[PDB]
Amino acid sequence: MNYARFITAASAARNPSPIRTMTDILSRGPKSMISLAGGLPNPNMFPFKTAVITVENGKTIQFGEEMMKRALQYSPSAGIPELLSWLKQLQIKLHNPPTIHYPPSQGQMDLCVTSGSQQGLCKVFEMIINPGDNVLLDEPAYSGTLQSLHPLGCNIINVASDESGIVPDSLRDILSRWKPEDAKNPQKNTPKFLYTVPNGNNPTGNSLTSERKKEIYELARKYDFLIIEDDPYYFLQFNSGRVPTFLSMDVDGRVIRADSFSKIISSGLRIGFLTGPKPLIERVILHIQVSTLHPSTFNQLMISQLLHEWGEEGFMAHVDRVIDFYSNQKDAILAAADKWLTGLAEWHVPAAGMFLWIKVKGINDVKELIEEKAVKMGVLMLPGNAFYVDSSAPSPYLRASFSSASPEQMDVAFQVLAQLIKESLLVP
Amino acid sequence: MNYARFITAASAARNPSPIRTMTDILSSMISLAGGLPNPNMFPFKTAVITVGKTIQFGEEMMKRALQYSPSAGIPELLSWLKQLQIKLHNPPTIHYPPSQGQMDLCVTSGSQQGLCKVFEMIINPGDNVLLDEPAYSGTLQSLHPLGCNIINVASDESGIVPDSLRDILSRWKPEDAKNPQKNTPKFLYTVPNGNNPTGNSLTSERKKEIYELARKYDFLIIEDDPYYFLQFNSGRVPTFLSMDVDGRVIRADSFSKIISSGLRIGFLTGPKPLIERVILHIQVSTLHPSTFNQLMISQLLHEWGEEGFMAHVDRVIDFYSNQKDAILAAADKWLTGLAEWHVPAAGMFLWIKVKGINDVKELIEEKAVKMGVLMLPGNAFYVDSSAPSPYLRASFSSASPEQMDVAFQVLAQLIKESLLVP
Ligand SMILES: COc1ccc2cc(NCc3c(COP(=O)(O)O)cnc(C)c3O)c(=O)n(O)c2c1
Numbered sequence: 017m018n019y020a021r022f023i024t025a026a027s028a029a030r031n032p033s034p035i036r037t038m039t040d041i042l043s044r045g046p047k048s049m050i051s052l053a054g055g056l057p058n059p060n061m062f063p064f065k066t067a068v069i070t071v072e073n074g075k076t077i078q079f080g081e082e083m084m085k086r087a088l089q090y091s092p093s094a095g096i097p098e099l100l101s102w103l104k105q106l107q108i109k110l111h112n113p114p115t116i117h118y119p120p121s122q123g124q125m126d127l128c129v130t131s132g133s134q135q136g137l138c139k140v141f142e143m144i145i146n147p148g149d150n151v152l153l154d155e156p157a158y159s160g161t162l163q164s165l166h167p168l169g170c171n172i173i174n175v176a177s178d179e180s181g182i183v184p185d186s187l188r189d190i191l192s193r194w195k196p197e198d199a200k201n202p203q204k205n206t207p208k209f210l211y212t213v214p215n216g217n218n219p220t221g222n223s224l225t226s227e228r229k230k231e232i233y234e235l236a237r238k239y240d241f242l243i244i245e246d247d248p249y250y251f252l253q254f255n256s257g258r259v260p261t262f263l264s265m266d267v268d269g270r271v272i273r274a275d276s277f278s279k280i281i282s283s284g285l286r287i288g289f290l291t292g293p294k295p296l297i298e299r300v301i302l303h304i305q306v307s308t309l310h311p312s313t314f315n316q317l318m319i320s321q322l323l324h325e326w327g328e329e330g331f332m333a334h335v336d337r338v339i340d341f342y343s344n345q346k347d348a349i350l351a352a353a354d355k356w357l358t359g360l361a362e363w364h365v366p367a368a369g370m371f372l373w374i375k376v377k378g379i380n381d382v383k384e385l386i387e388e389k390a391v392k393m394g395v396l397m398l399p400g401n402a403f404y405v406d407s408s409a410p411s412p413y414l415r416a417s418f419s420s421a422s423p424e425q426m427d428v429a430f431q432v433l434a435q436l437i438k439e440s441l442l443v444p
Numbered sequence: 445m446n447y448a449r450f451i452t453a454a455s456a457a458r459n460p461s462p463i464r465t466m467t468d469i470l471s472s473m474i475s476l477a478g479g480l481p482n483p484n485m486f487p488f489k490t491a492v493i494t495v496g497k498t499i500q501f502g503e504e505m506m507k508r509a510l511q512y513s514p515s516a517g518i519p520e521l522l523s524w525l526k527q528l529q530i531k532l533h534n535p536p537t538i539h540y541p542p543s544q545g546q547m548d549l550c551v552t553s554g555s556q557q558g559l560c561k562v563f564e565m566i567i568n569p570g571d572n573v574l575l576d577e578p579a580y581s582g583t584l585q586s587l588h589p590l591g592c593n594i595i596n597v598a599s600d601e602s603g604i605v606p607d608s609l610r611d612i613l614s615r616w617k618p619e620d621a622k623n624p625q626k627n628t629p630k631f632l633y634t635v636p637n638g639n640n641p642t643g644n645s646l647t648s649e650r651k652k653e654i655y656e657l658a659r660k661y662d663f664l665i666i667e668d669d670p671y672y673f674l675q676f677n678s679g680r681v682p683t684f685l686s687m688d689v690d691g692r693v694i695r696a697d698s699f700s701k702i703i704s705s706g707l708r709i710g711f712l713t714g715p716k717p718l719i720e721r722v723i724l725h726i727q728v729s730t731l732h733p734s735t736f737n738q739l740m741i742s743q744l745l746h747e748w749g750e751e752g753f754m755a756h757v758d759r760v761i762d763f764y765s766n767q768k769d770a771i772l773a774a775a776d777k778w779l780t781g782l783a784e785w786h787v788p789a790a791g792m793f794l795w796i797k798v799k800g801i802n803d804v805k806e807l808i809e810e811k812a813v814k815m816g817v818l819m820l821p822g823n824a825f826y827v828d829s830s831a832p833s834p835y836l837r838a839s840f841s842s843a844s845p846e847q848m849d850v851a852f853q854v855l856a857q858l859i860k861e862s863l864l865v866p
């Protein structure tokens with residue numbers, strides 16, 4: 017398995033910056049080192065000098081003068097080394113991927129810090145996708161991936177999904193149009209990858225089971241395609257005992273995993289990370305180098321100090337508090353839906369994340385109900401249309417986030433929704 | 445302007461997110477719309493940043509700083525930067541209707557992101573683009589995978605030579621810009637102040653000549669100006685943006701050189717239909733620039749005012765001007781007779797030509813690194829980086845005068861060792 021067939025010609029031709037070239041030789045020379053190489057602003061001319069950041073149940077984070085100069089300066093494209101090594105150990109403890117000690121050419125596990133998991137996904141899609149390429153995913157899907165994929169000119173093949181995510185039988189039936197050996201022939205145009213959000217899918221709230229992940233992985237080996245495991249709700253699972261990830265079962269080095277801090281630590285800091293085969297991670301870093309140069313040094317240092325002070329134990333205690341809060345929010349939205357929506361709509365318990373996916377019983381298109389009537393009433397939800405490749409098609413579905421509204425706000429919101437649905441159903 | 449000829453099919457196919465669409469429909473509200481983390485679950489609570497003044501993020505300011513924000517930037521930073529552009533450049537496009545290229549702005553994750561999104565918006569494989577070599581390696585390394593043909597325009601001590609541009613453009617007829625099969629240039633890219641790596645700046649007269657050739661052959665101008673606030677010459681030269689009567693200028697500005705490089709904050713100024721395409725691409729790549737870092741810059745600009753910002757740039761110019769003199773003094777002392785250079789007009793680089801060496805790559809990459817001195821070989825700043833180069837780039841931004849003295853003393857010795865061999 018070579019990574020060359022998956023990547024575009026343009027991604028393969030990317031070269032490191034002349035500084036990244038010098039940085040290699042910097043560690044091959046003496047300790048004296050005088051540098052006249054970079055266009056770095058002088059660290060003594062920065063207007064910010066020190067910083068103190070308070071942490072609820074934790075040590076205050078402090079950036080003294082020297083740390084502040086580093087925080088305000090350019091840093092490596094792949095991320096600061098202390099955050100990279102901490103995240104690498106986190107992945108090993110959580111997923112123990114088979115690829116850890118593989119040689120680099122065979123897809124050795126590598127990591128890079130990205131400006132949210134959105135940047136990681138975007139760079140992955142751009143590295144892989146040629147116009148006309150086949151890609152697999154289950155609809156409804158995250159609108160940010162659909163809007164990333166759409167300008168790339170790929171053919172998006174929808175794979176059926178139910179309460180337990182992707183239905184492996186649907187994937188098996190779709191793949192039966194090709195023969196396994198067609199993956200070795202580029203004119204056969206076999207799928208490049210399967211994209212999935214395995215825990216609390218945006219927008220469904222549905223999660224894949226361990227058994228289905230094993231079945232999906234075996235179909236990925238058979239037809240030799242990559243798996244893009246976009247897991248930002250990994251640390252927001254409501255089920256007791258986490259399900260193994262695709263990364264944990266990645267014997268082939270065919271999994272690219274996107275992780276985010278947006279849902280558990282901070283969304284505004286724009287900090288995520290990508291885990292996958294070293295040749296593919298290297299291509300992503302090179303693209304990052306010409307786009308954003310690197311993720312914010314300041315925000316990485318903040319997170320790194322918080323993570324190092326917490327330890328694996330303090331980080332896990334924070335996720336427990338987060339899961340407990342969202343689990344109560346999930347119960348509150350479910351109680352509001354039971355009280356006002358029973359008989360008018362279909363839904364079930366989300367397995368992870370922050371969304372409730374509701375199907376309105378006798379309405380073909382919910383877009384006018386949500387975009388017009390509900391807006392005039394002071395209630396904001398997302399119509400299902402936003403989560404399909406064909407967003408112009410009518411949708412009976414709506415996405416309701418339970419992340420921030422109070423139980424009483426959920427009650428009033430669903431009372432308004434029920435009233436508007438009933439009014440629309442009574443029109444002959 | 446027909447902006448459609450400067451935007452690829454993929455860029456035109458981009459749509460706003462469902463959240464932007466919902467927000468636009470809005471006029472007591474309950475929101476179950478966004479996948480926003482709960483703002484009361486964030487582990488960071490308050491922040492104090494010393495500037496002897498202080499910047500404070502109180503509890504609610506911190507919740508906003510740690511939360512998602514608009515793709516184009518936070519409104520207070522956008523309005524401050526918009527007023528800065530109007531005061532500094534007073535662009536003719538301010539009150540033009542949006543379709544006619546009304547001046548618009550967006551915050552980017554450094555000026556590198558802005559440039560990258562601009563190139564990806566305009567470039568189709570095989571398209572012709574103009575620039576002067578030696579050029580910034582970050583733009584060459586952005587353009588190269590895009591499959592465009594890079595046409596080198598001659599430059600001297602005063603930047604692009606308009607006669608060179610005029611001669612290159614003479615292969616087409618002005619009317620060929622209306623015919624897509626003629627493949628006329630899409631844009632001219634330039635760093636008008638303290639070019640990376642030369643340190644050379646364009647004059648007002650040349651900018652006017654280049655702008656008239658841009659109208660005649662209907663191409664855009666990408667004015668990448670991160671060293672705009674690092675000019676050593678008395679009285680700033682007008683920008684291409686200030687003379688943009690047509691709405692053909694896209695300007696990239698950065699805070700990396702004057703405020704902070706690690707914060708990843710820059711901005712793009714240009715025609716509204718072009719800026720809109722850039723925002724949409726940003727929306728699917730990074731979502732938005734860090735809210736926390738934008739709020740840090742915004743609060744600093746609020747404490748400072750235009751007065752404090754302008755006094756900071758004056759102190760910054762003064763510091764780099766002394767650094768420039770120190771590197772010039774070190775070059776006079778050790779390099780005279782061995783190398784060629786002239787006075788940089790702006791920025792942080794000295795561009796040196798080694799007198800009797802065809803390729804400096806082995807002298808800089810091997811010999812210099814071994815002696816503890818780091819510089820960049822000229823090779824890095826050309827489309828054809830495999831071609832031999834007698835040039836080197838020396839940055840005067842951070843080394844002390846005494847470090848420059850030892851560095852040039854080492855360089856001089858390495859040059860002599862390379863020349864003395866028959
Ligand atoms: C770790 O070593 C480093 C790191 C970064 C740089 C950045 C440099 N230049 C930046 C630049 C930009 C983008 O800058 P930004 O606004 O920050 O995104 C845009 N246009 C022009 C003309 C530029 O020169 C540079 O020259 N050297 O050497 C570096 C050396």
Ligand SMILES: COc1ccc2cc(NCc3c(COP(=O)(O)O)cnc(C)c3O)c(=O)n(O)c2c1
Nearest residue numbers: 132133134158213218246276278288463478479512
């Ligand atoms: C201003 O309103 C907003 C702002 C942001 C979001 C972000 C959302 N999701 C983020 C997400 C990402 C990228 O996340 P990041 O890591 O932060 O880049 C990756 N994969 C999946 C599956 C995701 O769901 C969302 O659903 N809504 O509604 C938003 C609404």
